[model samples]
Target: GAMAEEVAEIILPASTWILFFDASCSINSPAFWSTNDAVDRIWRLKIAHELVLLQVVLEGYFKVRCILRSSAPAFEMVNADVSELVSIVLPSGRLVACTTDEPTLNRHVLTVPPGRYRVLREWSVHEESKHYDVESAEAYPADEGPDGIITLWPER
Candidate 1:
């Protein structure tokens, strides 16, 4: 009975995306790295503490979630994640960068669509709240590496 329960818990919902890295260099440059190496490199370049990246591509649309963390009003010199509801649309194949320092945790969900997709970055936010204003919206290319922005591409 215990073993059966364990198996049941291991089963995930059908709607889950099976995220796996393909080493076949079809869409990417011809660098012959192993799957483990690819995963490590991708994570190391994309993810940073207090920052989150969420991506979703459905039917004819794609979505990218951008999260920013900042120091809360009640806390001094401590960082917390907050939430915001907004969406932005961009032309396909454009590299975008996001960085911020505010009491707001902006959860910007971007939706787009292509025939296929390769999720280069996706991360989790640690805090959740629905009270704050994002104040401003700025979009820049990844090459700038502005503050509060995390870049995913790497140097050769």
Candidate 2:
């Protein structure tokens, strides 16, 4: 019997972005980068996750607008609920601000605590939209993490 090697592909966002998260939230504190790792790793993770059968892309873009459910757990669909809210945890941004809305594609902003942290974009994003930003905060060490576990592992 012959086995096959699978290759995955991902399209990274061209926009300059950042994520604003409450670092005290997730057990998975994203690795700290002088820059936002979410904006960097999301694409790489997409490629690797897709390659490894962990995540698949329903639609490709820098900003997420909607999501759809799929048979593959890797492929996640954005909100179909009108009142559903997308929770994104990431570093601060130059434009976008944190917000919550009734899933009608409404734009709102949220105030974040001051600290260094990683972000997670749960649910969906809009291509035309900006990533949520944080308030008065300082950049966390790119090397600050427990056991150096969550560092930004970018691929060339």
Candidate 3:
């Protein structure tokens, strides 16, 4: 049996991206990024029960979103549109939010419970200052706050 030394192909991502790896998988792997699509929202590629990838298509290169622990009873979520409501399981009771796919430190890691959780993606992105204001700027800053919102709640 003759097995040659194998070379691996590399993937250099071109888009602004992020991932939610189950603190368990320690790994795995886009965007309305839209769960509004119902079929493609948060637009995810599930690599396993513990790992997933989210490609967000905002107006700029800055990653602008945040995760919150909440429920509609606490406030109003019926306004800006449902965006999309989906259920996911976090078997490990925790997840690490990273800009790229895989479990890496120096990232936003969350602690919750291992159960059925609903992820809500709501977007309120500005269209112009929006974008036209940046076409000629010498420099630009990252999103001051979330252009959109990601809320997590246990599925009841």
In lDDT terms, which candidate is top?
3
Please rank every candidate by lDDT, starting with the best.
3, 2, 1
Query: Judged by lDDT relative to the true structure, which candidate is superior, 1 or 3?
Result: 3
Q: In model 1, which runs have C-alpha deviations exceeding 4 angstroms? A: 1-28, 32-35, 48-52, 57-60, 63-156
Q: Mark the regions of model 3 whose C-alpha exceeds 4 Å error after superposition.
A: 1-14, 26-53, 58-70, 73-82, 100-106, 127-143
TM-score, candidate number 3: 0.52
Q: What is candidate 1's lDDT per residue for 6-116, written digit by digit as tens? A: 000011111112122222212123342323465454444333211223322211111122222121112211222333222222224222322111112222222223112
What's each prediction's TM-score? 0.20, 0.18, 0.52
Report the poorest 10 consecutive residues by lDDT, candidate 1.
4-13
User: Who wins the TM-score comparison?
Assistant: 3
Give me the overall lDDT of model 1: 0.23
Computed on alpha carbons, the lDDT of every model, listed in order, comes to: 0.23, 0.23, 0.44
Give the CA lDDT, 0 to 100, for residue 42 in model 1.
41
Task: Give the 10-residue window scoring lowest on summed lDDT in candidate 3.
Answer: 5-14
Give the clashing residue pairs of candidate 1, or none.
61-112, 62-112, 82-105, 99-148, 99-149, 100-148
Cα error, residue 8 of model 1, in Å, equals 43
